Write a protein that binds this ligand. Structure first.
Ligand SMILES: OC[C@H]1O[C@H](O)[C@@H](O)[C@@H](O)[C@@H]1O
Ligand SMILES: OC[C@H]1O[C@H](O)[C@@H](O)[C@@H](O)[C@@H]1O
Ligand SMILES: OC[C@H]1O[C@H](O)[C@@H](O)[C@@H](O)[C@@H]1O
Lengths: 250, 360, 51, 247, 359, 360, 250
């Protein structure tokens, strides 16, 4: 398309890549990212509707405690690029085809961002080596280099989708067999155990293991919701603290 | 005294703490964002190349992970600490490190639900409901509301962490933390157990892993009695078993009368059937069918006990506990570095194998 | 009833034929309350030293 | 209505007036009084139903230290007579009109029993004047005279409300607009909150507060009945006390 | 001489059950104590005697105490009167001395456990049993409360009578605080349980129903209708057309294959609910009951009301909020007739919530 | 220092100490069981028939009563003692007898409730619960768990005893075992309460012991509305209650149309009936019935309540609590060595009594 | 009734009677003894059902302090053999006409083992007589002979109850009144209480009574299985233990 439009799209994707990890101005969130990509490429309604229908999915997609997020940034950017590439915005092609492609590319962005943040350890090590010499310039520069690499992680894998055409990506994603799809599904249905594993490992004592087993035993009561179990944990902690501090006073 | 950083310097510190993330590592999480945020104050405090500088910069190269929004209080507190050290106030590095670690955890735990899971869902829902109409109002609304809330929180909490400074260190050292940490650990362990039980679905149904189905019984499952051609019969009072090896069962029509009065099973007048076969099912037959199903009585003629059913009858979430303990042992037995990523890929491969084998 | 490969804050993502599809099954307010409940329940988790 | 129901409800109101201050047999409590009027005046189940409905409100309605309670006695008796006069017990009309009428009657009984207890300051003076004569009969007679007087303090309003014809009261109850009746039915589940909050406010400490939330969290388990829940609370109490004392 | 039997003890029992009734505002619960004590004095001195007059003037003073916990005082007074009636040199004010200095602690103990702990629990249990209109509940309340009262009074009257003036030493301090704390814990725990269980303002309403999504094409209970009646089941895929739709196999419920058309409106077969089914008799009914037993929504479009989502958060959320608000306004208002005002205001809140359609 | 036993010898000693019981005697408790447990050490120490072997064997004709499971520590310490006695050490002959005599008392006192009365109830209850479903998993499960626990305990404490010697007296000492006794007793009481609640079923349905059945209501039970000749309608809005006392109700078929508009109940257009007499249920009526039953609405037009229902409404297992407390008092006061048997037969007679009388 | 079946039940009952004294693998417990006997002799589902039913009755049947237990071994074995001899497994007569028979044969086994152990003093006298010459072979042989006698105690009656004609036993077991059968069944559905009573009598203190009621009121939660309740009891006991220890130290 227009050269200015292409430059705008690439810069906007770079900002979205930056804020998929910065997560401060919410530049990467679909509601603004898809709408703003639509702003660059003419038609406003396509981007607005894609962002609106993707923000519903993107709720609660915040990475917490190193539990990496589904990376809505690349999902939004790539879905918007595919939508503008294919001249169809009947609000049915948007939901039927573009949204599942966005989810799959969100998983792809998940693996991409995990790879790049694993690579970030090298640059942070170089930053430590530079800060050994005690220069603000070196550490600031290495931090900026890591940030710009993370931004390029979406800047570069956007022109590829914008360039090749519009039908190879959708067909390629649709050609994935049930083999790997269901395998990854059952893998993700148990991956959270590892995430909780380090949390349990860090805080653990013979005094605290009983509470873990107590929670595990009491959990199957479906009548108590998660917030109910949280309040129950809080009150159990309060009671134990009161009973211990009663002897602490004496 | 001197080295009193002005309001402009604090605003620059906040505009740089804008970038707390970005140097996100797996081994030293979010560590460089702190240094980037405090660079202006440190630069105003010491010149580059100074040994005291050297030590100050090297101090902040440790683990620091929390919610980025609730870090301005911590930033202000450590800024106050740094300006205390600059003037020569006797406070060791251990004090600052303990101050940081004190609310690195609990503040993250309280900020994660209040921002990622409380404010953002509401703002995103309103933005999406506005955007469903194809109007440019929604993205600007989301942007303005979220950035205003975030900027107000950042600035005001940063200032509240600047003022009331060493007082918060006294509060930390007053023994309260020895209670906050214990309470948080107890609550976290309890909730972790609950989540291990609940948020780990290792459903083992599959097309394989199905234990052999047994013929069950002659009434433990839904269905009625079919006598020769048509009609539905109910078992009556037992009158005794004959010597040949068959017991005559009283037969009653679905009206309260008595007909037939014979034996049950193939050779008898009526035999047991499920709901699949009989047609013209009448209202009384429905009444008894829902009476049976509402009682918890079995449904399939051949009940199938999956491996998941056996595991649940043992204890729900058995496999989840076993996997948790296995990964705990793997993390305890030092299998070099990068162990979590290897565990993740191995478990994904294991899931693929389980699905293709027909187990899960 | 079919397999839920990925479940977003609303709806899920199954396979269906050869073309992937997404179905939304939650009203936005209900989805917001659901993510609120999940976040507050998991808020009990963590709260620890985190190294 | 046969006269047997009439004199049965009369005597039941009499004992209700007795325990309005006696508070020993609890014939004045709604679960007892409304049920009793249920057996006496024909329809019996509705008496139990609204007795249970109003008992929640009746908790926290005890008088301590000259602070006269809202007098659940007159409220219960008058509400029971109203239901047995008004042939509608659909558990919506039960909780719609009869409960707020009972609350207003409770305030009226509060002021009336305050007047009666004020009047008792005279009869006690005659009692001690007779005691100055050293006669046991005189003081006993004065005591049961006071008891009889407060028995009438609830017997007479019961007779008065029974005096009116059924058509007038049923038309007055039928003149209530539908929307307000259903709104009050909705709010019937609200008026118990203040009564519970009274007891909650009477005893509360930062040491004891967690138990309220623990009970609130564990209550949704529908398989544990009220008596089982009470046993659970008791055993929690002895466990806490045993662990606290040994320090 | 002048030793009292057990029959007179039962008489002073039954005359102490009328401790209230002669209640005033400056000298409360005065004549009830005399009504209790009289038979012992009748056995001791004849009516009209100067000693009887002095004893009548003895118990004429101020005596306020929780009624249920009064048997220890009645027994102590009985023992002291028996001792004074056989020429012992105790001071005449010793009875007033022991009474005046002890009603405080006994009342302070008696009020919470009896009025605020035992009665609320028993009444709530009775009402929970009575919610079905069953005669079991009033009988249970009557029997258990009367039995508790009778046993307590009988045990305590001899606890005071047999011991004498040592009851003050027996009670003392600290030991009663344990019972106070236990009663408070139990009462407020049960109060929380009742808050959760017996505050129902369900928000179903005509309004407060969130918009319903058409949902899906097989995720709810139903069967595949095929044009001119009959019921079919989806089979395999015969190849997706270039338009974007795929042709499947419409297997009859007999093992055969027929139709071979696309699904949805113009296709041979499409999903439909149980509402529009005809001649539903057969294995179709078994399939339907299996589907609903699988945990499948009956309606084609799922509808959620505010009560359901509130329960999804945590049951009794509005009850907790209302209780906290009422507690705060009770602590702040600091009035005399505030409870009635709060009650009528809550009635107005209920009627406005219902008129708006929320509940 | 020669005469040192090997690991296989230790395993053989444990396997034969497994056979400790067998010579049950009222005059010398398990006298030669200990001898059989210690046989091979003396077999490889000295040939039978010599004075040393004769004395070493003869040293075990004393009273020896202890819990059979906790006997590996004694075996290990005695093997250790005899090793030094056989290695030219001046250890006193009667020291082994004295330490054994001291060990029998407290060790048996603590192992008696822990094994027979604490863990055995757990394993037996779990096995019975698994077997109630008619599954083969229960007996094999019981075997494997019990054998694993017993083998692990036996082998590990035998190794500990041999490696430690007489120092296990200081290892246990006093006070330590009190904690295990208290914890085991607490666990036993809790699980006994659970078992008493769960596995004592005296369901009081019977022909008698049924309270009178209430007529329920006019729509509080699962059913539909019938207007004379077929068809099913639904109650509508109120047009105004008549002065007689009945209210006119709108009747709507499964089309939205309003016909009849009569008074509900018998004499009017349509009346509420159960599904027993319904004919040709096909249509949306089945959907309505499914919705009603999914709403928890009862099916029987009359609510029949039994005595077991009343007790359940009070609390499940109430009569079980009464029975167990009465029985506890009975053996607390009767004080007869045979008393449990007599209780069993008498309450069997009582069980016959309720069945004939119609309560049970 | 194949000859392999006779030899299987003979050796199996011999092992069960052995376990009445040694009691390590617990072959004599009804849950395993009856289940394995049913495994040997054709039908097993009714066998495992009856074993599970009798296991709870076997609760609290451990011999302590030279006081011999009701000896559930002979009860279980003879009841299982009598059941398999009767072609009637409607789950009613198993709790109706077998459990009371199990109790009666338990008393019979008690009176048998009392005499057997009383006469074992003679074989122990012979054992020390053979020990007076100084050989382990003799005492080992006498130990084996004593165990052989103990096993035969159960082995012979198991054979005599099997060699009887099946027609006589099936006529006898069907000659009982139906009402007495149902009465014995409903009574045996309650006898298990007695089994726990002595246990509660053995361990009971003011400190420990509240736990019994806590478990009694928490048990109605069907969503918690018996193993879950075991873990719950363990954690509760552990928590109380640490609280009391830190209160004593505090
Ligand atoms: O809570 C820990 C914290 O870790 C990282 O900084 C980010 O993933 C945050 O979203 C998260 O809250
Ligand atoms: O202790 C207060 C107690 O004494 C008061 O005089 C009476 O109103 C009693 O009803 C009350 O319970
Ligand atoms: O501890 C003594 C010991 O004596 C016998 O061997 C058996 O009754 C055991 O159950 C008991 O434990």
């Amino acid at each position: 398309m227009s050269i200015i439009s292409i430059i705008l799209v690439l810069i906007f994707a770079f900002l979205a890549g930056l804020e998929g990890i910065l997560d401060q101005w919410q530049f990467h969130q679909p509601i603004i990212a898809c709408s703003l990509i639509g702003i660059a490429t003419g038609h406003m309604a396509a981007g607005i509707i894609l962002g609106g229908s993707l923000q519903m999915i993107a709720l609660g997609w915040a990475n917490v405690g190193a539990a990496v997020a589904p990376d809505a940034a690349l999902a939004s950017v790539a879905s918007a690029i595919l939508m503008v590439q294919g001249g169809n915005f009947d609000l049915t092609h948007i939901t039927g085809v573009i949204v599942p492609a966005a989810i799959l590319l969100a998983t792809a962005g998940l693996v991409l961002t995990t790879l790049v943040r694993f690579l970030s350890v090298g640059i942070v090590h170089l930053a430590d080596a530079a800060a050994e010499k005690g220069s603000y310039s070196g550490v600031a520069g290495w931090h900026m280099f890591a940030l710009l690499l993370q931004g390029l992680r979406i800047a570069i894998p956007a022109a590829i989708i914008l360039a090749i055409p519009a039908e190879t990506v959708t067909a390629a994603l649709n050609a994935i067999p049930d083999w790997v799809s269901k395998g990854l599904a059952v893998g993700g249905g148990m991956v959270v155990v590892v995430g909780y594993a380090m949390v349990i490992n860090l805080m653990a004592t013979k005094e605290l293991w009983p509470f873990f087993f107590l929670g595990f035993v009491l959990a199957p009561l479906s009548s108590i919701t998660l917030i109910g179990m949280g309040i129950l944990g809080v009150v159990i902690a309060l009671i134990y603290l009161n009973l211990s501090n009663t002897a602490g006073n004496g | 005294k001197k080295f009193s950083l002005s309001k402009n310097t604090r605003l620059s510190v906040m505009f740089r703490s804008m970038f707390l993330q970005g140097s996100w590592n797996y081994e030293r999480m979010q560590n460089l964002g702190f240094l980037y945020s405090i660079i202006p104050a440190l630069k105003q405090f010491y010149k580059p190349g100074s040994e005291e500088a050297k030590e100050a910069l090297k101090r902040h190269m440790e683990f620091f992970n929390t919610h980025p929004y609730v870090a301005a209080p911590i930033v202000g507190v450590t800024l106050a600490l740094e300006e205390e050290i600059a003037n020569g106030v006797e406070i060791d590095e251990a004090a600052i490190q303990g101050v940081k670690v004190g609310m690195m955890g609990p503040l993250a735990g309280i900020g994660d639900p209040v921002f990622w899971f409380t404010v953002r869902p509401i703002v995103g829902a309103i933005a999406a409901s506005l955007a469903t109409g194809g109007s440019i109002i929604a993205p600007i609304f989301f942007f303005v509301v979220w950035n205003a809330i975030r900027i107000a929180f950042l600035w005001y909490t940063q200032e509240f962490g600047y003022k009331q400074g060493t007082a918060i260190t006294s509060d930390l050292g007053g023994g309260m933390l020895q209670q906050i940490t214990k309470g948080a650990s107890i609550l976290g362990m309890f909730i972790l157990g609950v989540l291990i039980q609940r948020w780990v679905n290792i459903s083992f149904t599959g097309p394989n892993a199905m234990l052999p189905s047994k013929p069950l019984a002659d009434g433990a499952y839904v269905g009625e009695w079919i006598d020769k051609a048509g009609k539905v019969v109910v078992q009556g009072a037992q009158t005794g078993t004959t010597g040949d090896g068959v017991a005559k069962f009283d037969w009653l029509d679905q009206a309260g009368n008595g007909v037939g009065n014979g034996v049950a099973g193939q050779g008898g007048f009526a035999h047991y059937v499920t709901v699949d076969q009989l047609n013209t099912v009448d209202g009384s037959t429905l009444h008894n069918i829902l009476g049976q199903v509402s009682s918890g009585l079995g449904l399939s003629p051949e009940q199938t006990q999956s491996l998941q059913d056996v595991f649940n009858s043992l204890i729900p979430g058995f496999i989840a506990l076993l996997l948790t303990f296995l990964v705990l042992w793997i993390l305890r037995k030092w299998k070099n570095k990068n162990a979590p990523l290897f565990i993740i890929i191995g478990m994904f491969v294991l899931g693929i194998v389980l699905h293709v084998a027909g187990l899960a | 009833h079919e397999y839920h490969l990925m479940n977003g804050a609303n709806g899920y993502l199954t396979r269906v034929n050869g073309k992937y599809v997404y179905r939304v099954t939650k009203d936005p307010v209900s989805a917001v309350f659901g993510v609120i409940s999940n976040g507050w329940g998991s808020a009990g988790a963590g709260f620890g030293p985190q190294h």
